[PDB]
Amino acid sequence: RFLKVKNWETDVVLTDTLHLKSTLETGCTEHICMGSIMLPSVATKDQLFPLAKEFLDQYYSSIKRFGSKAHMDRLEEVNKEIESTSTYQLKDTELIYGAKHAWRNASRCVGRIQWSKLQVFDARDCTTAHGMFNYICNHVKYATNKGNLRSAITIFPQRTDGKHDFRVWNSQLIRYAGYKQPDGSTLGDPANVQFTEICIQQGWKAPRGRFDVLPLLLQANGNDPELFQIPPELVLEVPIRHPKFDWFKDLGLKWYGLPAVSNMLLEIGGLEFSACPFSGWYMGTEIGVRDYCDNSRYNILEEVAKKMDLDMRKTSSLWKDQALVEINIAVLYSFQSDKVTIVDHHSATESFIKHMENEYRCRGGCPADWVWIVPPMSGSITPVFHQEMLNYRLTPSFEYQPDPWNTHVWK
Ligand code: HEM
Ligand SMILES: Cc1cc(N)nc(-c2cc(CN(C)C)cc(F)c2F)c1
Ligand SMILES: C[C@H](O)[C@H](O)[C@H]1CNc2nc(N)[nH]c(=O)c2N1
Ligand SMILES: [Zn+2]
């Protein structure tokens, strides 16, 4: 019960005691492992205090004033506020620590070497969807920083009763639209075809093309959500060119610089933040491999193989692999010749091993989801493929949450 994780590329071995602090459950039992299930699966005051205590204990431990008077009075203070309101409010400092450690514990995140460099935007004074829009806009502009991207999170008011939730209804602040066609097929992004429809049902006017930036659907205090259009000067986009093939210009592709997940739930000391968009920068593969070449996404292996003139008759010609490697050189190249922050799957996976070492040394471990950490191309030529990882669920944490349109008691 002081487990060992080995690397088989380097024979390096690390000891994990951090998993002992784990509290939540994984999905796995002694007789079944669910490590490749994607989504494995109101709160009272009784449950609420251990979670405040637990969180408050590590936060003061982190500023190296564990259990002091300043801690015990904060423990007493929260306890009484959970008596008084059956909930409580986080200090500015507790919110930043909590948020940063949700990221630090995001076991499916490969870019976590950066977890301490996170800009926390406190939007807990927000009351309206217009305020949400305005907080998100400052987030986008700040985190984009002219392309020298910066990690940021914007934390809207915590869930209270359940019927008054702040939700960003988009899965990401910036996504391209998804239009099915009369002839069945799909323009834009097939991922978002329902969301694109919801925006239309609430009154969007779609420029029914490809890389159409969707509008924000912001629900404030449980109210029915409202559409807002991010000023296009804030939506930084990178046109994809290849450093060889000039028909790659005519491919006519671009991606947005800012990956910013808006649909997850941030958990700090038992408090539930249902609207907490967070942003970093892209590893190339999520664009080049997944976005562009997932079969039910942009599905561009067909055309990129074409304009290379490749043996598409047969499967064993690896024409798909060949076209994938070029696509990803191009995504990278475009982003870097534009000074827009991006990381290649090699650089990022090496950093994660370096980050893993730091974690096991100064923290006793690092939760990691090998299914998610290994880049979706060239697996074994990246050092994380060869790295055993213990996955376990620490807190504070980012958590999946149901889409608001399945849950929303509407009017
Ligand atoms: C700064 C550069 C960052 C890089 C290079 C990076 C990299 C990645 C990648 C490649 C994924 C997999 C995405 C996918 O395949 O769908 C991911 C997932 C994730 N990352 Fe990061 N990320 C960064 C920033 C952040 C930040 C700022 C946070 C939180 C504040 C965060 C927390 C997460 C979460 C919650 C997930 C998804 C877990 C899930 O979907 O179940 N990351 N990251
Ligand atoms: C902060 C950040 C950096 C980065 N490189 N990627 C992501 C990211 C994560 C998911 C995970 N789930 C919501 C499916 C989906 C995406 F499309 C992303 F872009 C987020
Ligand atoms: C079936 C499997 O769980 C699913 O494809 C997962 C696999 N690993 C992944 N890893 C990352 N980074 N992103 C993903 O979307 C997925 N999808
Ligand atoms: Zn398992």
Side-chain angles (χ1 to χ4, degrees):
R1 196 68 203 277
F2 314 93
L3 296 147
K4 302 280 179 66
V5 325
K6 192 182 168 175
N7 181 302
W8 298 87
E9 211 213 306
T10 61
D11 283 308
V12 168
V13 183
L14 294 161
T15 302
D16 193 294
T17 54
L18 185 58
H19 70 278
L20 297 174
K21 294 281 284 291
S22 166
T23 162
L24 267 143
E25 306 203 3
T26 59
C28 298
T29 73
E30 277 106 293
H31 316 90
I32 184 149
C33 165
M34 312 230 166
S36 88
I37 307 304
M38 196 106 87
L39 337 157
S41 175
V42 62
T44 97
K45 356 171 184 164
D46 318 292
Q47 333 145 319
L48 211 59
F49 189 68
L51 313 190
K53 180 184 202 312
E54 201 192 316
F55 169 79
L56 289 182
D57 274 290
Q58 53 205 233
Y59 165 63
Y60 281 105
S61 196
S62 106
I63 55 197
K64 270 135 199 181
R65 305 134 136 286
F66 185 9
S68 58
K69 180 125 188 65
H71 171 200
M72 292 301 166
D73 283 309
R74 181 93 192 87
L75 207 89
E76 177 113 37
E77 171 165 58
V78 172
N79 194 34
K80 294 154 153 178
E81 183 177 10
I82 306 181
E83 304 285 351
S84 168
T85 0
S86 64
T87 176
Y88 71 99
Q89 290 294 117
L90 292 156
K91 293 281 154 203
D92 276 15
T93 57
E94 295 162 354
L95 194 66
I96 288 145
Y97 170 95
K100 279 177 178 195
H101 276 75
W103 180 9
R104 188 185 198 178
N105 298 337
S107 69
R108 297 180 160 174
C109 184
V110 66
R112 286 186 276 166
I113 188 191
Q114 278 274 25
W115 68 272
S116 84
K117 257 215 166 290
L118 176 75
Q119 182 51 43
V120 186
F121 285 117
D122 187 344
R124 289 174 303 161
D125 63 348
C126 193
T127 68
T128 45
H130 276 76
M132 283 179 86
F133 172 64
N134 187 60
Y135 268 113
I136 295 186
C137 280
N138 296 339
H139 180 134
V140 167
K141 185 170 202 186
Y142 171 83
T144 305
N145 186 35
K146 313 200 319 285
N148 179 19
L149 266 43
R150 295 181 287 195
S151 303
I153 188 171
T154 292
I155 296 170
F156 290 101
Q158 66 209 39
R159 158 183 289 125
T160 41
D161 61 317
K163 297 96 222 274
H164 298 109
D165 279 350
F166 286 73
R167 296 296 299 280
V168 186
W169 284 35
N170 312 51
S171 37
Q172 298 166 44
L173 303 185
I174 292 167
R175 301 209 69 172
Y176 297 118
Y179 316 97
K180 36 166 86 163
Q181 292 293 54
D183 60 295
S185 55
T186 298
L187 184 45
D189 194 337
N192 315 314
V193 177
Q194 179 174 18
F195 180 75
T196 303
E197 262 143 31
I198 299 161
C199 294
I200 296 162
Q201 182 134 327
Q202 307 289 254
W204 199 41
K205 280 261 70 189
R208 298 193 128 112
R210 206 111 115 112
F211 300 112
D212 304 356
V213 186
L214 289 142
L216 296 169
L217 239 202
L218 310 174
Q219 155 183 12
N221 192 252
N223 281 257
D224 302 330
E226 316 163 14
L227 285 152
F228 311 82
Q229 191 244 121
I230 312 135
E233 63 266 39
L234 295 190
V235 193
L236 168 63
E237 292 179 285
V238 177
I240 314 302
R241 62 253 181 221
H242 201 273
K244 312 284 190 202
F245 305 87
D246 278 82
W247 52 268
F248 216 102
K249 318 182 162 346
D250 280 313
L251 279 187
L253 304 182
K254 57 172 154 179
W255 207 247
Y256 47 93
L258 200 74
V261 153
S262 57
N263 61 3
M264 291 188 67
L265 190 142
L266 166 62
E267 217 237 66
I268 309 174
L271 299 184
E272 291 189 330
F273 295 100
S274 50
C276 55
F278 55 90
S279 67
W281 48 84
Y282 266 117
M283 195 173 57
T285 59
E286 332 163 46
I287 313 184
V289 188
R290 308 304 310 288
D291 292 327
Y292 284 160
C293 295
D294 265 10
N295 264 331
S296 55
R297 292 294 303 290
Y298 273 68
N299 202 20
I300 72 164
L301 280 180
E302 285 269 48
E303 269 289 66
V304 180
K306 270 210 56 176
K307 282 134 197 179
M308 300 174 63
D309 229 52
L310 294 184
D311 187 3
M312 284 184 54
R313 302 143 263 187
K314 276 66 193 168
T315 169
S316 15
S317 58
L318 303 199
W319 60 270
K320 278 188 182 169
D321 301 71
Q322 199 89 103
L324 191 92
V325 174
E326 309 285 345
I327 290 179
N328 276 268
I329 293 182
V331 161
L332 294 193
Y333 175 76
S334 312
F335 267 65
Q336 303 157 300
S337 302
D338 280 7
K339 225 122 196 63
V340 177
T341 309
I342 200 168
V343 67
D344 66 62
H345 48 287
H346 304 289
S347 199
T349 54
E350 198 220 307
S351 94
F352 187 67
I353 298 291
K354 208 147 149 288
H355 169 62
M356 240 171 137
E357 297 168 24
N358 303 324
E359 286 284 281
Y360 279 82
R361 170 163 29 80
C362 69
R363 198 186 187 201
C366 180
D369 190 335
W370 187 112
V371 172
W372 275 68
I373 295 279
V374 173
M377 72 173 294
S378 320
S380 50
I381 77 174
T382 70
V384 292
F385 177 103
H386 309 285
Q387 171 68 49
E388 294 172 11
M389 293 159 196
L390 295 180
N391 193 24
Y392 47 90
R393 322 240 313 113
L394 303 176
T395 205
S397 70
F398 290 104
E399 296 302 341
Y400 281 135
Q401 80 186 324
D403 293 318
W405 58 87
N406 315 329
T407 4
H408 188 37
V409 173
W410 221 320
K411 288 244 198 237

